[PDB]
Amino acid sequence: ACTKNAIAQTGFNKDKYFNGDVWYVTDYLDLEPDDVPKRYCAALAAGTASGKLKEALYHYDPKTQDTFYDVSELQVESLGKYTANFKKVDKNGNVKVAVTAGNYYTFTVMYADDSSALIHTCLHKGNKDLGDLYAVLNRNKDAAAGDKVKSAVSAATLEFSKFISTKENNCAYDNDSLKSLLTK
Ligand code: HEM
């Protein structure tokens, strides 16, 4: 179960974050550790499409090759805090698993600048028991976490040394699919 009410960044700039571009997960912290594999690739695009706030997600397990995309129209709880009812899609936006009640994630932007971000997410999916997941994002898939985002990790009373990097998984991403999924 999730346990954190993450606080959104003071002064969060929504239009800059939701600009239609891609964010890569470089490091993550799962509070229920073997909730998720130790090795993993994830990325997202976030933007407004025809007036609607959207995210597109990509997950890839580099060992099993398990791959999935999702798209969601995000609902606002407060500035920097969203609820996302997701639908599983192929890379072209064709629906594989439709939106349903109880399949949603929350999404809190704790820190962001033009290049980096720290988010909290709580996933709800059917009758699964899932915990809090923090992710360090960068616009550059190979970027080491810098001082702004690492300080934000500290300010959240987290230890960056506990985060797991995604950099040794040889992750390769279809940025075009993520951008185009925002419209779907
Ligand atoms: C970037 C932020 C992230 C968001 C918003 C997010 C969101 C989601 C969503 C919505 C699903 C369900 C998709 C579906 O069933 O269609 C999912 C599944 C999953 N995510 Fe993430 N995720 C993120 C990052 C990660 C990372 C970094 C890992 C790390 C290992 C991860 C591991 C998983 C796993 C293992 C599942 C499968 C859950 C299951 O069905 O048992 N996610 N995630």
Ligand SMILES: [N]
């Ligand atoms: N996740």
